[PDB]
């Protein structure tokens, strides 16, 4: 035994609970709101430009890296589509690899008769 310090895993919000950023041009702000049907579930988070921009850039960089390595790995149910935009250095696909013959099937068959 090593007495691990266990973290946690949690479910995400159901699709009926929207969570989005809205741009208010009256005050030129970006407000993050998590609402089910217009009712703010938590406190709204209003940020300035260059405050929303930094977080958006950080999350976009993280998502880009995550999608790239998900495509590289391949076992994520959607990486096959993203493998096209990958550098071929990072993966090998068998659709363009062939054996000495195109398949392993044998189909040479005889027809006719033989008499003794």
Partner 1 sequence: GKARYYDQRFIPALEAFNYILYKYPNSSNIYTAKIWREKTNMRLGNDAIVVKNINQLLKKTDLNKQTFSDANALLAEAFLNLEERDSAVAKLRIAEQFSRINEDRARYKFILGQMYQEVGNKDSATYYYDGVIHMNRKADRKYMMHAYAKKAQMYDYEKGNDTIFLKTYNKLVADRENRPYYDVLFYEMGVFYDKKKDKENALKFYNKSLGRKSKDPYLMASAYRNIGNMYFKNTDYTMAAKYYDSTL
Partner 2 sequence: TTRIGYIDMEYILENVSDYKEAKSQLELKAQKWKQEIEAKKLNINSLKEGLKTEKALLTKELIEERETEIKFQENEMLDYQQKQFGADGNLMRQKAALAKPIQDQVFTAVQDIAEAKNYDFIFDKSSDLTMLFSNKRFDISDQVIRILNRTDKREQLNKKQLKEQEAKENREN
> What x/- string results for residues 58 through 87 when contact with partner 1 is judged by CB under 8 A?
---------------------------xxx
- The answer to whether residue 7 forms part of the interface with partner 2 (CB under 8 A) is yes
- To partner 1, the closest distance from the beta carbon of 89 in angstroms equals 8
Of 10-39, which residues contact partner 1 (CB under 8 A)?
Answer: none
Distance of CA 2 to the CA centre of its chain: 35
Question: Does residue 31 contact residue 46 with C-beta atoms inside 8 Å?
Answer: yes
Phi, psi (degrees; rounded to nearest 5) at 71: -65, -40
Torsion over CA of 76, 81, 86 and 89, rounded to 10 degrees?
70
- The answer to whether residue 92 forms part of the interface with partner 1 (CB under 8 A) is no
- The answer to whether residue 91 forms part of the interface with partner 2 (CB under 8 A) is no
- The answer to whether residue 57 forms part of the interface with partner 2 (CB under 8 A) is yes
Number of residues assigned to the chain: 116
């Amino acid at each position: 035994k090593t007495q691990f310090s266990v973290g946690k895993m949690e479910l995400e919000n159901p699709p009926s609970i929207l969570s989005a950023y809205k741009y208010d041009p009256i005050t030129d702000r970006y407000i993050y709101t998590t609402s089910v049907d217009g009712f703010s579930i938590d406190y709204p988070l209003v940020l300035t430009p260059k405050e929303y921009e930094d977080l958006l850039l950080k999350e976009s960089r993280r998502d880009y890296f995550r999608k790239k390595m998900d495509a590289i790995d391949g076992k994520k149910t959607g990486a096959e589509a993203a493998k096209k935009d990958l550098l071929p250095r990072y993966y090998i696909n068998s659709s363009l690899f062939e054996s000495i013959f195109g398949s392993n099937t044998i189909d040479v068959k005889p027809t006719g008769s033989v008499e003794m």
